[PDB]
Amino acid sequence: GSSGSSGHTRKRYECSKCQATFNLRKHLIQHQKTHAAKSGPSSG
Ligand SMILES: [Zn+2]
């Protein structure tokens, strides 16, 4: 339909931490909270 390439994004929001998909934008915002695992290779 004479569409324009400009625009490479999915209709859903993916998580670059657990590879999970979400429907609501705000839903992912909070989900990312549990992904606040600051690098800690020196943790017993
Ligand atoms: Zn995630």
Could you tell me if 12 and 22 are in contact, meaning their C-beta atoms sit under 8 angstroms apart? yes
Distance 31 CA to ligand 1 centre (A): 6
19: domain CATH number is 3.30.160.60
> What are the residues whose beta carbons fall under 8 Å from the beta carbon of 31, sequence distance 6 or more?
15, 20, 22
User: What is the domain range of residue 26?
Assistant: 11-44
What's the 3-state SS for 7-41? CCCCCCEECCCCCCEECCHHHHHHHHHHHCCCCCC
CA 25, CA 37: separation in Å to the nearest integer?
Answer: 21
CA 36, CA 9: separation in Å to the nearest integer?
Answer: 25
Distance 42 CA to ligand 1 centre (A): 23
Query: What radius of gyration, in Å, describes the C-alpha atoms of the chain?
Result: 16
Distance 27 CA to ligand 1 centre (A): 11
Smallest CA-to-CA distance from 15 within 36, 38, 31, 37 is with 31
Q: Is residue 32 part of a domain?
A: yes
Q: Is residue 23 part of a domain?
A: yes
Q: Which amino acid is at 24?
A: L
Q: Is residue 3 part of a domain?
A: no
CA 37, CA 43: separation in Å to the nearest integer?
Answer: 12
Q: Is residue 36 part of a domain?
A: yes
Distance 4 CA to ligand 1 centre (A): 31
Structure determined by: NMR
Q: Is residue 5 part of a domain?
A: no
